[PDB]
Structure 1
Amino acid sequence: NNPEYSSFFGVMGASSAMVFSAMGAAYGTAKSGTGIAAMSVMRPELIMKSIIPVVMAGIIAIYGLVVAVLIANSLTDGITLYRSFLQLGAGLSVGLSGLAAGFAIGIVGDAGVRGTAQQPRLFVGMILILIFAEVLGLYGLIVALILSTK
């Protein structure tokens, strides 16, 4: 009674959840790393504070990792298709939302870190902005979890 090919959707979800969120975190980390290098040569004393955008970027990738595992552990051969579609949507929701978050984290990290090099008071504002990008990633996780368990 189960339509063959049905698993294709859910399987692409589990992968997409990791792949797209990984690209986001990869952008965030890479973009921040360049800004960090610029700051640190000018002044290395902040080297342990400018790393934060990178840690945040990683958390985004984790959001995707969590969903990718939840989907993979929810695959079966006798899949009812409905659940497979939910898994694809859930995987894309967190993956693509984390992807957007990754760009948000990278762009503001680079600008914030480079600015902080000149103005130490910028640190607090940078963190608050970074918080919004992490929240943007979480919203994706929330929806993905709702769909995958629906």
Structure 2
Amino acid sequence: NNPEYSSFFGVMGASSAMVFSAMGAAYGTAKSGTGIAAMSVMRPELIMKSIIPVVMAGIIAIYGLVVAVLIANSLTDGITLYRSFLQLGAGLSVGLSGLAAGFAIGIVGDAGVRGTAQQPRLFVGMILILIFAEVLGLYGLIVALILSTK
């Protein structure tokens, strides 16, 4: 059958994979930037190190972009409805997992950057937490890379 609207869900999947990942990364970057601004006044030498959270947030966006492009490359005029649903699911997975990971990274980075201004030893700990948070996004990506290619 291949209904004429079959590609709608795949396109929405690409749009989600990019939009929600971008939202998560934007929140992460905003919170980390606020923390870095509030930290650098007293501890200027820590500006470059304490930029690690932003990078992590950026990585989340990358994830989304990948999936989005992948979904964008898997589209086609006669895309079967099953594949369109698969791609919508992959897009929602990656996008919302990236949104959650970006929120977590933003909060963790703000807190850890502010704390490291007062307790240098916290730095490594923050990194660990950040990694865990970022892994969440990776999980979404993995699921997306299982769905968009299923």
Question: TM-score normalized by structure 1?
Answer: 0.99
Query: Which consecutive segments of 4 or more residues in structure 1 shift more than 4 A?
Result: none
- Render the CA deviation track for 1:9-62: whole Å, top value 9, x for unaligned: 000000110000000000000001000011101110111110000000000000
Once the 2 structures are TM-superposed, how far is the Cα of residue 4 of structure 1 from its aligned partner?
1.4
Write the distance in 2 (CA, Å) between the matches of 1:34 and 1:9: 37
- Render the CA deviation track for 1:127-150: whole Å, top value 9, x for unaligned: 000000110110000000001110
Give the equivalent residue in structure 1 for 2:85.
85
Give the equivalent residue in structure 1 for 2:149.
149
Q: How many residue pairs were aligned?
A: 150
Write the distance in 1 (CA, Å) between the matches of 2:98 and 2:80: 28
Once the 2 structures are TM-superposed, how far is the Cα of residue 85 of structure 1 from its aligned partner?
0.3
Write the distance in 2 (CA, Å) between the matches of 1:122 and 1:8: 47
Question: TM-score normalized by structure 2?
Answer: 0.99
Give the equivalent residue in structure 1 for 2:116.
116
Write the distance in 1 (CA, Å) between the matches of 2:25 and 2:48: 19
Write the distance in 1 (CA, Å) between the matches of 2:19 and 2:97: 12
Question: Which structure 1 segments of 5+ residues have no match?
Answer: none
Once the 2 structures are TM-superposed, how far is the Cα of residue 79 of structure 1 from its aligned partner?
1.2
Once the 2 structures are TM-superposed, how far is the Cα of residue 107 of structure 1 from its aligned partner?
0.2
Whether 2:22 is the aligned partner of 1:22: answer: yes
Q: Does the 8 Å CA contact 2:7/2:76 hold for their aligned counterparts?
A: yes
* SS of corresponding position for 1:120: coil
Once the 2 structures are TM-superposed, how far is the Cα of residue 103 of structure 1 from its aligned partner?
0.3
Write the distance in 1 (CA, Å) between the matches of 2:63 and 2:27: 16
Once the 2 structures are TM-superposed, how far is the Cα of residue 65 of structure 1 from its aligned partner?
0.1
Whether 2:71 is the aligned partner of 1:71: answer: yes
Computed over aligned residues only, the root mean square deviation of the Cα atoms, in angstroms, reads 0.5
- Render the CA deviation track for 1:60-100: whole Å, top value 9, x for unaligned: 00000000000000001111110000000000000000000
Q: Does the 8 Å CA contact 2:6/2:78 hold for their aligned counterparts?
A: no
